[PDB]
Amino acid sequence: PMFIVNTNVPRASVPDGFLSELTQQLAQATGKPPQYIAVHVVPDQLMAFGGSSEPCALCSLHSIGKIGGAQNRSYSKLLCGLLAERLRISPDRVYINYYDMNAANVGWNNSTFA
Amino acid sequence: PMFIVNTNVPRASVPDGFLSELTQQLAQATGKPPQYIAVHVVPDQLMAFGGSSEPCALCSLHSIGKIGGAQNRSYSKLLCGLLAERLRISPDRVYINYYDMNAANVGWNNSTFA
Amino acid sequence: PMFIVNTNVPRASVPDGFLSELTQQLAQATGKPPQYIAVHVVPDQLMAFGGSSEPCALCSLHSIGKIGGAQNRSYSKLLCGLLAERLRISPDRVYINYYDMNAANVGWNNSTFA
Ligand SMILES: *C(=S)NCc1ccccc1
Ligand SMILES: *C(=S)NCc1ccccc1
Ligand SMILES: *C(=S)NCc1ccccc1
Numbered sequence: 388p389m390f391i392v393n394t395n396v397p398r399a400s401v402p403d404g405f406l407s408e409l410t411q412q413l414a415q416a417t418g419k420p421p422q423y424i425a426v427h428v429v430p431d432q433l434m435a436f437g438g439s440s441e442p443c444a445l446c447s448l449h450s451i452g453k454i455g456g457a458q459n460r461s462y463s464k465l466l467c468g469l470l471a472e473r474l475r476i477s478p479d480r481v482y483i484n485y486y487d488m489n490a491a492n493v494g495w496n497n498s499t500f501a
Numbered sequence: 502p503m504f505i506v507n508t509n510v511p512r513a514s515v516p517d518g519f520l521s522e523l524t525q526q527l528a529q530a531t532g533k534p535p536q537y538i539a540v541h542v543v544p545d546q547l548m549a550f551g552g553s554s555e556p557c558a559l560c561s562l563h564s565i566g567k568i569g570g571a572q573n574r575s576y577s578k579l580l581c582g583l584l585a586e587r588l589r590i591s592p593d594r595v596y597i598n599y600y601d602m603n604a605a606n607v608g609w610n611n612s613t614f615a
Numbered sequence: 616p617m618f619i620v621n622t623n624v625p626r627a628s629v630p631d632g633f634l635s636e637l638t639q640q641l642a643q644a645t646g647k648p649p650q651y652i653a654v655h656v657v658p659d660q661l662m663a664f665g666g667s668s669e670p671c672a673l674c675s676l677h678s679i680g681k682i683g684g685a686q687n688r689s690y691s692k693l694l695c696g697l698l699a700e701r702l703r704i705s706p707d708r709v710y711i712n713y714y715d716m717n718a719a720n721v722g723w724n725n726s727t728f729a
């Protein structure tokens with residue numbers, strides 16, 4: 388599973404250890420070992436949500452499996468909660484795109500996960 | 502729609518009001534409420550298009566519905582037009598990836614749109 | 616074909632000519648003329664892979680066709696090889712998401728590739 392956050396919140400407002408917290412929390416939520424989890428946080432972005440430049444975030448979760456109706460609802464609650472708590476972003480100013488990747492379409496270590 | 506532009510054009514060359522203009526035009530093109538539209542502009546990028554580092558853009562448009570052959574052609578004419586007029590990027594140095602997202606795969610406000 | 620790499624490796628460690636090498640190697644691998652290939656390298660990113668922040672990369676290859684189990688394995692070997700050689704990133708700290716795009720869902724030059 389790989390999680391990316393793009394936000395207009397400044398770098399100084401991203402807490403130390405946020406990347407580790409995301410990693411741990413995603414490991415719990417997906418049931419995957421932390422070793423397979425990648426996280427990417429991009430602050431200071433030029434963005435708008437509903438025309439407004441108040442704090443917001445655009446995110447994605449790519450995962451080989453562990454994607455679906457109920458799971459994505461649970462991920463959204465978890466991830467919006469973390470962004471609200473740590474970055475002071477309102478959940479109604481967060482989008483999260485979910486992608487169920489085929490193993491053959493994820494490259495890693497000179498090969499794919501197929 | 503959420504619309505992201507990555508470009509090697511410098512930040513200073515992105516005109517004031519550009520995010521608002523994108524938001525407004527996308528609302529009319531896609532027939533979606535401006536309140537839901539997210540836009541993200543990423544200047545000063547290290548990129549090449551056809552091996553050249555002349556001004557270029559790589560973009561994406563994610564939407565729940567309102568994606569299709571004719572609609573995408575229309576969005577491209579619109580979006581290339583804006584990138585040409587405002588950022589001085591030639592339309593033939595722009596790629597835009599269109600994504601028709603399932604509602605179950607888009608998180609927002611602690612849940613999904615499903 | 617369009618290739619993006621996000622990495623925590625610093626800008627100064629991206630060698631001169633790297634965008635060209637990527638362009639050229641992708642032309643070879645995909646069979647597509649370099650004129651049709653776009654590349655984007657994003658250094659200095661705030662990232663973790665497996666919980667830690669030794670050099671790592673999250674990448675994507677979007678392509679109209681030329682995507683599949685065997686082809687993706689070959690792309691991964693090539694691209695990991697490049698990232699290892701030029702950016703000194705271990706192949707086992709690299710993810711590459713592969714996307715087979717429909718021509719109608721790629722905008723270019725005021726239209727689509729359909
Ligand atoms: C997140 S995308 N982890 C990578 C992976 C590899 C193999 C099986 C499941 C997940
Ligand atoms: C326009 S109303 N976009 C809302 C959206 C659609 C798909 C993914 C994220 C956000
Ligand atoms: C990479 S996405 N090149 C663009 C393209 C256009 C038409 C056919 C194949 C590839």
Ligand SMILES: [Cl-]
Binds near residue numbers: 566567
């Ligand atoms: Cl609609």
